[PDB]
Every structure is written in C-alpha cells, then in structure tokens.
Amino acid sequence: MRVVIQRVKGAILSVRKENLEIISEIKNGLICFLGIHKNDTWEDALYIIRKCLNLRLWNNDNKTWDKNVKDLNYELLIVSQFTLFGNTKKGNKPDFHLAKEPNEALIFYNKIIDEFKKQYNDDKIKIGKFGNYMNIDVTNDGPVTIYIDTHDIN
Amino acid sequence: MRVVIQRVKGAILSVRKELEIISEIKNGLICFLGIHKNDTWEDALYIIRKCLNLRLWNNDNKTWDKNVKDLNYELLIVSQFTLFGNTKKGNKPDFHLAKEPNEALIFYNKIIDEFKKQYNDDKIKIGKFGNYMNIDVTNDGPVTIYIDTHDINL
Ligand SMILES: Nc1ncnc2c1ncn2[C@@H]1O[C@H](CO)[C@@H](NC(=O)[C@H](N)Cc2ccc(O)cc2)[C@H]1O
Ligand SMILES: Nc1ncnc2c1ncn2[C@@H]1O[C@H](CO)[C@@H](NC(=O)[C@H](N)Cc2ccc(O)cc2)[C@H]1O
C-alpha cells in the first residue's frame, strides 16, 4: 500500500453531476491519497491507518513535530488514488499494472474507511468518490508531504 | 532524489510578509522535490526528464496521452525535505537523509535552471526555499505520481 499524506488548512472535494458539486469538505487536517497494491493484505492497511492517525505532523508549545491528528481533533480526507502505482520506469506513458482491480479495491477501500472511523471517529473521516473524476481545492499548510510504501517495513 | 508530482488546474503560492502571493500557475504540475544528501546531477536529470515527459493528461478519447510540454502547461517546483521524513522508527519523522540546506539550495537552484533550459524560462515557477509556504491548489483528477531515483539504475 502507498500513501501520500499532505497537511492542510482545508480541502473541498467535488465531482461531476453530469450523467461540479461539493460532496465533501474538511478544515485543518490531512489529505491522504491512498493506493491499494494488488497484493495488499489487512496488515498493510493497518500500518497505514496507524501512521496517518499517529504521525506527529504539527508543532505544539514551541516544540516541533509534536502532535498527531487525533490530539488536535483534526480531520482526515481519504482519497483513492491508483496513480501511485503508475510505473514511470519505462517511457512516457505510465502503466498501472501493480494496482488492485477496481472491484476488489473498492471493498478493500471501504473496509479501510470503516477501520479508520473505528480507531478515531465517524465524523472526523471524510472520503471522496471511488472511481469518479474529482476536483479538490486544497490549502496546503507548510507544505508538509509524507510518502509511505508498505512494501518497505515489517 | 524524491518527487511527488500532482496534476493541477491552478496553484497560488503565498508566504508570510499577512500572506503575500509570490507565485502562480494555472494548468500544470506541482512538483514537491526532496534532495538526498548523496544525489548527483544524474538523479536530477532523471527527475527533470520525467516531470517534463510523462503523459499525464488525456486527449479526447485517448488516455494518459499528453505531457506538460505537449500542452504548453506550467510547472511549480516546490522544495520539500519532508519526503526524507523517515517514519519507520517512531511517530516523529527524522530528516537525516535530506541534504543540508545551503548545499540543497545551490543544487535546487541548478535544478530550476536546467528545467528552464529543457523547457521554457517562462513556464517554470518556484516557491521560496527554506520558508513557510501556503499553497492554494486545485487538484485535477486527482493525479499523484511518486518517483524515488534510488529505486532505479541510472
Ligand atoms: N488500486 C486502487 N487503489 C486506490 N484506488 C483505486 C484503485 N483502483 C481503482 N481505484 C479507484 O478507481 C479510480 C479509477 O480507476 C481511481 N481514481 C483515481 O486514481 C483518480 N480519480 C484519477 C484518475 C485519472 C484518470 C482516470 O482515467 C481515472 C482516474 C480510484 O478512485
Ligand atoms: N534537502 C532538501 N531538499 C529540499 N528542500 C530542502 C532541503 N533542505 C532544506 N530544504 C528547504 O528548506 C526548508 C527547511 O529545511 C524546507 N521546507 C519544507 O520542506 C516545507 N516548508 C515544510 C516545513 C514546514 C515547517 C518546518 O519547520 C520545516 C519544513 C525546504 O523548502
């Protein structure tokens, strides 16, 4: 599993209504762009969940890297992104072969979302719209960008 | 050397003087660039070639088909040491892998110069290295790409 975590003052997420309208909004918090690998297991997901929730990305009391999202009662917007498995190693056109197929990915993603809300709180976890074109107006704070690939630890 | 490339409709970059705008792009890419203490010129040339050549926009009916240069779009290069934020140990990132600020700035300035030489002086915008930045961004897709050059054989 791969995640890019960005620290924000706000994020406004919107989709097409045409078959843009705002479907989700956060203030202070994190936006987490999350890629599900075809071989991901529950263990991968748990590690990402723990890290997003516990990473000390805010300053407190004139001390750096001190507080996490839960501490400050901040929000998280979770956005599904298969582009992180974009192989850029060959030429100009990225391929996305490492990504989990969208049907499996969706149920996996929903499970992750539920697990997020379980360790924190239902009101503090916002999502986008798996499989849909999205527009996200984001106020980047710092900016602070953290990358994690689970294929590198335990 | 590490980079997070995001596809944008626009990005407005602001620093504390309260917030003065120093830099603005419409359509293009924002690149969050982290320089590693052992990075060579070759690592840079690989990132530059990729930000410039990767086919990240669709083109009516065709998917992942056009790059930033094809479309005559812009690039906002933003210096980011948080990409060397190691989060494997505790929950406080450490940044020992990141090249020291003055050497980093010198290297970053060269990188900007080579971007301009490979594309166009007018099309490459930057942040304020070493400074707190606020970045109002409109993510388009979203599309997020991560590259680490120590994962490939130059
Ligand atoms: N493996 C996956 N991990 C995370 N999200 C996934 C994965 N597979 C599918 N998705 C979801 O399905 C969408 C389109 O396939 C994924 N969407 C995206 O990555 C962005 N909306 C960008 C995008 C850009 C172009 C395009 O043709 C499709 C999507 C994600 O919401
Ligand atoms: N090795 C480096 N690679 C890229 N940028 C670097 C590097 N070293 C220093 N910088 C620049 O100097 C700042 C502090 O080191 C870096 N700033 C940032 O990464 C963002 N403003 C995030 C931030 C936010 C707060 C803070 O106290 C430090 C950093 C970067 O612009």
Author numbering:
A (entry chain A): 1 to 19, 27 to 161
B (entry chain B): 1 to 17, 26 to 162
The authors write:
However, a freestanding enzyme D-aminoacyl-tRNA deacylase (DTD) removes D-amino acids (D-aas) mischarged on tRNAs and ensures that D-aas do not get incorporated into proteins. Mechanistically, the most remarkable challenge that DTD faces is to specifically act on multiple D-aa-tRNAs while rejecting L-aminoacyl-tRNAs (L-aa-tRNAs) without any specificity for either the amino acid or the tRNA. The enzyme is a symmetric dimer with two active sites per dimer that are located at the dimeric interface. A mechanistically unique solution to the problem of enantioselectivity employing two carbonyl oxygens from a ‘cross-subunit’ Gly-cisPro dipeptide has been shown to be responsible for D-chirality selection and strict L-chirality rejection from the active site of DTD.
PfDTD was co-crystallized with a post-transfer substrate analog D-Tyr3AA, which mimics D-tyrosine attached to the 3′-OH of the terminal adenosine (A76) of tRNA. The ester linkage between amino acid and adenosine is replaced by an amide linkage to make it non-hydrolyzable. Similar post-transfer substrate analogs have been used extensively to study proofreading mechanisms in atomic details for both Class I-specific CP1 editing domains and Class II-specific editing domains.The crystal structure of PfDTD in complex with D-Tyr3AA has been solved in two different crystal forms: crystal form I at a resolution of 1.86 Å in C2 space group and crystal form II at a resolution of 2.2 Å in P21 space group. Crystal forms I and II have two and eight copies per asymmetric unit, respectively. This provides us with 10 independent observations of the ligand in the active site. The superimposition of all the copies of ligand from both the crystal forms I and II shows considerable deviations in only the side chain atoms beyond Cβ. The lack of recognition of side chain atoms indicates that residues with different side chain chemistries and sizes are treated alike. Such a side chain-free recognition mechanism provides the basis for how nature has designed a single deacylase to deal with any D-aa-tRNA and reveals the crucial role played by weak hydrogen bonds in D-chirality selection. Therefore, the key to identifying the mechanism, as seen from this study, is the capturing of the D-Tyr3AA ligand that is bound in the actual substrate-binding pocket.
